[model samples]
Target chain A: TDDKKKGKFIVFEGLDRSGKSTQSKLLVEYLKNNNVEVKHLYFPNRETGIGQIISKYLKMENSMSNETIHLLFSANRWEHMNEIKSLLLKGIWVVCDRYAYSGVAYSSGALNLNKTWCMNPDQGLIKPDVVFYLNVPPNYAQNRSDYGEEIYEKVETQKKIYETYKHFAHEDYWINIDATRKIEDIHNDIVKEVTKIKVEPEEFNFLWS
Target chain B: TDDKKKGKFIVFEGLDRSGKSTQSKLLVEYLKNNNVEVKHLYFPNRETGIGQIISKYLKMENSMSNETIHLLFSANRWEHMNEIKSLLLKGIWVVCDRYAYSGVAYSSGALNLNKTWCMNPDQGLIKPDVVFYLNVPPNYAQNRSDYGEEIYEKVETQKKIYETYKHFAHEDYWINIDATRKIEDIHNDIVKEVTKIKVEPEEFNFLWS
Candidate 1:
């Protein structure tokens, strides 16, 4: 049925400590405050059964190999597909902080992992309608609070991750947000971009394959 | 940088009452008995929060629209991507009763739903390597126990769903198991196919754009 029933899926993509999380939360709150229904979902949803293992891997407590963690990250995104779709169909905006892009960027950035390999497990999944790539230099991101603790937080690694994002960002609808700006500035920037774009009807796409 | 650590993903696809559920379960048990680590997963996981909603929709009690129910089914498949990938990487045989194809089939069967509209929410998702389509006549399926309780259980709807499946099953590795035979016969047939095929590490394709 051409019911036009679904809301938009807005995804925030960026390196860690780039304020993707902050902006995502703010967007959700702003939408809710405006009485615009919204739902906030984070990818690599490290809370489910598989997520427990991924959480362990992220904490550096699990001894699984790099390949294992990379695939798990992609798998983690798969676990939340239904919830996101349901929310969108209910006319609720789904604001996700990191999704398929994170899986593609992080895994593809691994030393031995190619784009093809990293993209394989994520085939036939939901694509984001709008992907905001929050950009900042590695040094600047490091100066941001609590940036150095995570597994993919190193400067060089962050550089590669950003490069992978750059490659993936070649898509037409991706927005590059300058995270070097003040919090209010970034928020307004996002608001401006979102306001200008007419929300597309929910569409699906394969990540790489 | 080309470390050969990648694993293969094999998926089983078929309409409901196609005997895929039984065959997939049997395949898992067979693989296990042969000391092959395997994982079995199905769509409409019915366990997560969103799945609970889908389950309700299937039961005809939840007043979800056709589009809502369709998106929910796709979302359910995504809920378990991480575990499936992890199991595959661990060299376990991950037997899936239904995956993206089911999303394509059932949603496309709706008179008001176009193929493009149905395919949108599931983009950028994972695709299975080997999608086994358990084929059977509509009459053959109607004879199965517990036949007409859920959606897509009608023989006429089953026929439309099969047509949709035929349209979507495009991969070179797609397998068609004749489901008219007894459950054991079909199970043995799939086992032989599984044994004959050598799954090397390879990247897979996704559904639509």
Candidate 2:
């Protein structure tokens, strides 16, 4: 929105312990190394006043209804949507670890709350330009380190969440990578897909429905 | 879920300048004066990295797709869901100005995206305990302030949003208040409602399904 050209928005999504966080971090570092201005974000920030509450909930330090926690997750994003915009407008690439796909998949999987209910809180917020989904089987997630505790961490729950994630992936824009591949192999695959798209950062009106 | 019982979670929903923000602030002050620990949160919190993007979108500073922006808004919440839980667990009353209800109302009203598509991203986030909606006629909002550059600022768009808000209210746990009443009168009515409920800090949990 500033005087500079708009930047590309990229998001990475996957189930817990699916290596999304690792891949996202690597991507940001990779972009920065190439001298691209970049912004990186993760869900359940757990730093703000509200984030602290979210942290407690995840740690099982508190009990909350599924709906209540779900909205809070959405609120967390609302609280920070502006920063991403500035970076983009300034020609800085913005990379997100989970983005909207996680919200849709995790929340819908937790409660039979319609996917619509899960997605509502994010309406009118900034949308990412590209979504990079890290696809991995349930077995990998189960064997991964630090994979339990939260409600959506169970094997059955993760399976349901995977189905939900696939249902919402925008077919035209989604790029799937096999998580079973070696980390370097997966990263290269991601880079190959990313390179195919030439980011021009065109001028356009605000993002939102 | 914590050892310490958290206070109640209250949300105020309405169009911009419908006095929802003012009323929530007043209520927070009132509760705090009465020795209740309370925290206030406003949606689209333009303070963090993601929030900056949301702010730009609201100000027409960024360009993105309807679905993308919608997901961002939902992701915004996902980023903070757990923090609200911790605040409640600490016996601190968390007061929200516009939560999931706003998401449903605004997104569904936009009409660019269908209700189901708009609703997908926020499924498992937090739900409000008590939602107090400030209702006012179009003329009232028109008189309060000039329309901003935001996409949802037009009167017709707001009217549509109002309808969507009503639809969700009919199907959810929300209370509507006629904000045309004198400020003090509205305040008194809110106090009356608060008194009718036993909002013991220890009984905090999500209120909606």
Candidate 3:
């Protein structure tokens, strides 16, 4: 059928304050102004049934074991997969602030859980067309606004998350962005990359198996 | 220090209506009357913060994917591990209604999630001194009291779960009991098995890696 009618799934990933939300918003605005129908999303979505649990854990209103938090994060994403997949199939572009990579990276961070174990729950999830890893050192990110609002926003874990995210790097699937640059500059790079994505409509490929 | 002070961890595993709770209660009573100090526990504990979520899902008040439910069940167990370990360390026998094996077995039932993936979250969890598998076919279990109270109580699923439980059997680690027999007969077998356990209070061994 060769339907290029479906939308591309684009994701922005990095440490919490690595400007993922900022750059994602800018990119979404740019796409809409260009007449592209798009939706913006963030992970550990904190809205759904499963995510509400994650929300409480993050808000420090409750506690969970390390493995519990990791799996809840993964479950949050899975709970939303049906909606995400539906949007993409209906020709709506999805720009996500974080995705499965963040779940695996953060869990495998200073928590010292096995990477393979951390990765297993997210397997067979929809793979993004492109993952923009906003490259910023933990020190640089710590200076960004809205730090320390959540339970896992500490610098030590962020540093380990920064290190762990590199484990998912691929030459093509992951595009590195120097997020410390001006907002417009990062947005511009993202625009160029999206246009050059080389995507044609196909059945969804999955994340790590 | 070789404390030898920790008590043996015993688990009851079987289909939902296969008399796990009954046998576990009877065994606990048996041990207490024999002047042995013991504790009784259950999983997807439905009491802790994480478990409350699982409780909802099982009650069908909430929805979750197969993987999400699996991880949540494992997480429920992990959240209670600290207390369970402490009790055992204090020389208290802990008999459980269900544990990691039941989590893995049920999720890996007709759901067909990878057994390896189902196992990863529960890795490093305190292993039972012995697991008693109450062998009963699903048809027999279906006739027991209070069936279909939970979302996962269908016979098709129970059949698959019964098959999945076998994947975890080991000669000494798992003791098979004929649950279809008279209650007293099954209790006698379980009592015999518990008395024969060669526990010496070594450091705790863990569930699947």
Candidate 4:
């Protein structure tokens, strides 16, 4: 990143259909309307070289060891971060859906892998300025339209994923918001919370450091 | 591995066209004739999930970050290591061609990536009981039958990879032999050096610990 002004790296995180994607888009829209140069991004973005591998693994077209699969997820973030850093350096605000938190939490929680080991490969990833965690439970999410989802079918795994996020949660940068509220209300809360992170020349800390 | 009795883990290391594959096979034959239970293994074995990605990456059909590629290499070893440990536990000796050292040295020297960072993902992988460094310069291998190799053409990269191996080399476990010598002479040298490590549980150390 440049030595001068840089964009803030904001991220959204949650279980499947916790309104993470929806809110990320909404935040980008609100920031754009406020005359902000913002863009939206997502994890396991399957267009790049590393992403394609993760894509194949996620799509069931491929299989890997639990350790390898988790490392692949974090590696994708590292590969994409080069571009993410460049954009942020150029004063372009980033609204990202999912980041290293999802990688560390979901993989360890679901597979019972060691949390410290899971955090190793992702030790140097870029930290988000702020993260809006949409806390939506499986019981509540099943009634919603996205229930038949393969990822959400396993109740125990989903619950563990939800709990694992708490292992690294904090009030300063990790903002926990109840996703059971109205869509507009949640968006407003996110906008208000993200407002604290301004566009300035700030050094990005390593994710797990 | 079992607590009382474990197999010895021997490895071969060298740049391309250094007669590595040749010597490993010869050693396997020698050990088998002496009634020792041994198996030969090699890196980038594309039969497994992690290996398939490495296969694509190496075959030029797939591309990835230097970090991802190196991490993928280590991940494959971690995945295959379960099987390796099981075999060793059952009192079977392992003879490997190119291992974690190859992953660390080759990737770092070839791409100029961080050496410590490159070694991160593979920190706890299996360590070799003994390593035979078949020292063959690119200049000498050029006149050999396997000169026109895609991996051997880059003179500077090969030299650096050769040099990088020495960074972790030691006389106790790392044995360096000139591959410029006669084929049978090198094989005799390898068999003699490997004779030092017996098949006993002893303690297994972490790869980079």
lDDT value, candidate 3, whole model: 0.83
Candidate 3 segments exceeding 4 Å error: A1-5, B1-5
TM-score, candidate number 1:
0.53
Proportion of true inter-chain contacts also present in candidate 2 = 0.12
**Per-residue error at A30 for model 1, in Å?**
1.6
Q: What's each prediction's TM-score?
A: 0.53, 0.55, 0.93, 0.88
Interface RMSD per candidate (angstroms): 9.7, 8.0, 1.7, 2.4
| Candidate 2 per-residue lDDT over residues A40-85, each given as its tens digit | 8888788965577678888888866566567667667766766776
Tens digits of per-residue lDDT for model 1, A60-159: 7765544546655655675576676677667778898987778767877744466765665566567667888898876668877777776778899888
**B1-209 in candidate 1: lDDT tens per residue?**
33232445566777677777778888888988988777777777888655676677777775544554665566566556667656655666677777776777787874446776566556656666677788876667676688888866888887788788887566577888787788888888888888887667655455552
Residue A101 lDDT, candidate 2, scale 0-100 = 66
Best by lDDT: 3
lDDT of 4 by residue, B1-209 (tens): 24533888888898877888899899989989998899899986778766777788766776777777777787777777777877787778899998888876788788677787777777777787888899987566766674554443567778788778878777577888988999999988888887766555777777765
How well docked is model 4, in DockQ terms? 0.52
Model 4 bad stretches (over 4 Å): A1-5, A47-62, A137-140, A146-148, A151-153, A202-205, B1-5, B47-49, B59-63, B137-139, B145-153, B201-205
- List each candidate's DockQ score: 0.06, 0.10, 0.60, 0.52
- The order of the candidates by TM-score, greatest first, is 3, 4, 2, 1
Q: For all candidates in order, state the fraction of native interface contacts they contain.
A: 0.00, 0.12, 0.60, 0.53
lDDT of each: 0.71, 0.73, 0.83, 0.79
Question: What would the TM-score be for candidate 2 when compared with the true structure?
Answer: 0.55
Error of 4 at B152 (Å): 6.8
Interface RMSD for candidate number 2? 8.0
